[PDB]
Each structure stands twice: as structure tokens, then as C-alpha cells.
Amino acid sequence: GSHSLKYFHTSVSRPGRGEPRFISVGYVDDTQFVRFDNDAASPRMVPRAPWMEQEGSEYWDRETRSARDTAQIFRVNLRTLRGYYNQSEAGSHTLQWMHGCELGPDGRFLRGYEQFAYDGKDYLTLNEDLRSWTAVDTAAQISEQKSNDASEAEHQRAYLEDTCVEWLHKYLEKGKETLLHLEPPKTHVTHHPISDHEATLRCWALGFYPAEITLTWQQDGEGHTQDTELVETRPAGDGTFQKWAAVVVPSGEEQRYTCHVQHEGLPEPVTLRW
Amino acid sequence: MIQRTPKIQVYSRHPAENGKSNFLNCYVSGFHPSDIEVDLLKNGERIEKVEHSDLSFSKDWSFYLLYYTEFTPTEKDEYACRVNHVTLSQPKIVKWDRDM
Amino acid sequence: RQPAKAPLL
């Protein structure tokens, strides 16, 4: 199947309290595997997946240097952006950076992306052609010109098509036993009477990986039962995910309702009744 | 400036069984800015030494975090999550329901 | 691994 190597960088300025807080995390598919947090005297990039301890000290030293330098660059960018918008020093502001490379089912480079946001809104985008930028306003147009002056699109294209692709291949091989292992959901249905005439049927999906999943309550010919309550897919805390879907049914008709669960770890979709 | 209030889910890692070791989770997601206060409560009292995951965000730039601790569910103990954020006029308390 | 040099804005 398809796979992705993704990083998320966040820098938040702390007025009157020193350098901005900087936190970055790396993901392979739906699995976090590294983290960097500058809230320390000697901040380090550290593993967040057990299979990354196969990486030696040189890897960790290099990633620590890269992340420390990114934080300093982001402190500069926050100051630059504060001047672009003529904003006071008394206000807290946020700069975010996300980038990633995605492989197709053939294992070849399919798409790369890179984007910046300021105070929770799109700021500057590296287009999927990997050769041009798009600015959201006049401030970001100056940032676009800087990127043009430095051939930044060419530099980021090289990272996304070469460095990113190569290391995604390495990570997938080192963590194959978990990254390439589809974990099917464990499913069951719970029943909670609301009154003498109504009841809640809750269809559970527990302990699955990856996070992509579909839950539907079927009521005879209606595949998506009216007023089905879906919760956002949520992490269990152990690397797997959870989700449930609930419906209120007339008491005594629970047998007319069927829950469908579709997940890539299931050879066929599963149906359940209370 | 884009601000988003956090969505809140309080739940256990495994199906709750009284007297059995488990993990109480509080998942805050879809919020901006990243600064947030999350507390886990046992019978209205704050639980000490609660850990949380590394700050990450989604495609729309909104952040998400998982707060978690070890707990022992019982019949009478009342667990809840208390969330405070710049978008909230007052702190929000969401009780733990073992059926949700 | 992550980029060595992050873009300037």
C-alpha cells in the first residue's frame, strides 16, 4: 500500500519569557517515531518508537543539530513575520511547518508537499510541482521572493524526492514488524436502554491500526441510519486506535439494525448485531 | 488569527472492568492555539503526574494531544477531564463514561 | 530524517 514520511514543526513565541517554544514530531504513516522539544537545557531529538533504537549515535547527533537549527530559524521567522504585520511584542504568535513525501502502492515517489502557517492560517505553500510557491497575502509574497532568490523550491524538492524517499524506505524496513502489520479492529455491540420505548446501540471498534476505518449502522434498506452518532477516531495510547458509532432504536427492534466495520486489516468487512 | 476550541473525549484504553488496571485517556483535538490546560480528576480532585503525548497537528493546522494516566475503575469512583483554553469562557468538565 | 536547513521567511 501507500506510505508517507511526515514531519510537523511548531514554534510559539513567549512574550517577556525568552525564546519561543519549539516542538517537532515525525510520523511514518500513523506511527510517531521521533520528537524534538527545545524546553530543556540540552534538547535532543529522541525516538518515540522502539525500533528507532536501531539507529546509532551519528543519526541522533545529526537530527539533533537539524532540529536545534530549525528552532533558531523559526525564532527568526516569527520575528520577521511580526514585522511584516506590524505586530506588538506583547502578543503570542504561532508558526507551523509541515512537509512529507508519499509513496504509491508501487513504492515510488507519488507526491511531496510543504506548507507554512502563521497563527493557524495558511501562509506559504510549496506546490505539488515542487518548483513554485503560492503566497496567501502580501507578507507571504515577500517570503515567496526569498524562496525564489535561494532556489528554495529546488532545495526542498531534493529533500522530498531523494532524502525523504530514501529514509522512508529505511524506516519501513527497520520497523516492518509494526509499520507493515495491519491490525484488525476488535468489534462488539453494546446496548443501553434510554427509556421503556427506546434504546442505544453502540458499535465498538478497538485496537486497530492504521487509523483509517469506516463504521455504519444499517437499518434494513438504509445503510447509513438516520442520526448515527460518530466519534472522531481516537488513539488508545498504545499505538492503536478506537472508534464507535451509536444509534437510538425503538425498544424491541434492535434486531433490524446491523453494524458494518471496514478496515484494511480485515479480509472482508465485518457485520455485527446486538 | 484563527482560533478553534478543543474537541474533548474521555475514555479508557481497554474496556473498563472494576478492580482491573487500565488507562484513563483524555483526547483534546482540533484546537488552536496550542496552549491548553488539561487535568484528569478523581472524584473532583486533580490527579497528580498525568502524562501527555508530543504536540502534533492536522492538515487544517489544528493541534491534538492525548493526556493519560494509570487508574483503577470502580463502580463509585467518578472520573472526569477538565479542559481550559483561550476559546472557553470557563473551564469545561467532561465526565468519564465507561460506555463511551 | 528531517531537512537540514529550514526555509527563511
Numbering used by the authors:
A (entry chain A): 1 to 274
B (entry chain B): 1 to 100
C (entry chain P): 1 to 9
Copied sentences from the primary study:
Human leucocyte antigen E (HLA-E) is a non-classical MHC class Ib molecule homologous to H-2 Qa-1 in mice and Mamu-E in rhesus macaques (RM). HLA-E exhibits preferential binding to a highly conserved set of nonameric signal (VL9) peptides derived from the leader sequence of HLA-A, B, C or G molecules. VL9 peptide-bound HLA-E complexes engage the natural killer (NK) cell inhibitory receptor, CD94-NKG2A, thereby protecting healthy cells from NK cell-mediated lysis. Whilst VL9 peptide binding and NK cell regulation are ostensibly its primary function, HLA-E, and its rhesus and murine homologues, can present peptides from microbial and autologous sources to CD8+ T cells.
